[PDB]
Amino acid sequence: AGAFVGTWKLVSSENFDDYMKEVGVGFATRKVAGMAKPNMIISVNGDVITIKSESTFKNTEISFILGQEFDEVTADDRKVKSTITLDGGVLVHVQKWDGKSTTIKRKREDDKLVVECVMKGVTSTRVYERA
Numbered sequence: 001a002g003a004f005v006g007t008w009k010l011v012s013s014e015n016f017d018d019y020m021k022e023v024g025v026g027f028a029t030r031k032v033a034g035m036a037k038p039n040m041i042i043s044v045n046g047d048v049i050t051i052k053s054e055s056t057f058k059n060t061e062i063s064f065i066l067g068q069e070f071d072e073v074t075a076d077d078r079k080v081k082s083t084i085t086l087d088g089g090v091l092v093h094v095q096k097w098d099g100k101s102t103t104i105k106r107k108r109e110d111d112k113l114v115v116e117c118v119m120k121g122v123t124s125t126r127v128y129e130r131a
């Protein structure tokens with residue numbers, strides 16, 4: 001989607017440590033990930049969407065087709081089954097592993113990209129602005 005393409009820099013984050021804890025991330029990884037301010041680079045070619053995330057902590061990349069489940073290795077090394085759909089202009093990403101699920105919604109709001117991460121009762125909100 002047009003709205004998403006770009007290079008995005010994290011400018012604010014709320015509740016991310018709690019989110020990571022709920023997901024099961026160990027303390028040492030939480031410490032470094034929680035202080036990261038990544039750049040997110042979203043691009044599209046035809047049916048394939050690529051989301052690259054870059055930081056001094058680590059880099060990740062996913063490439064996917066909407067509605068096609070794929071295997072993903074997360075930044076914390078979970079091996080998850082991911083499915084990403086476009087729902088009312090929002091990219092909705094569900095990760096499933098070990099009977100658990102987390103949902104990551106990526107939305108365009110004014111000139112920002114807002115990421116809402118939910119695991120059980122924890123909701124984290126991360127805001128990015130154009131680089």
Ligand SMILES: CC(C)c1cccc(-c2c(C(=O)O)c(C(C)C)nc3ccc(Cl)cc23)c1
Pocket residue numbers: 020023025029030033034036038039053054055057058059060074075076104115117
């Ligand atoms: C790879 C580098 C750039 C990085 C730095 C900081 C946080 C993440 C991260 C993200 C993310 O913002 O890309 C996410 C999103 C899917 C919500 N989920 C995560 C879950 C567990 C852990 Cl430990 C880290 C992350 C990734």
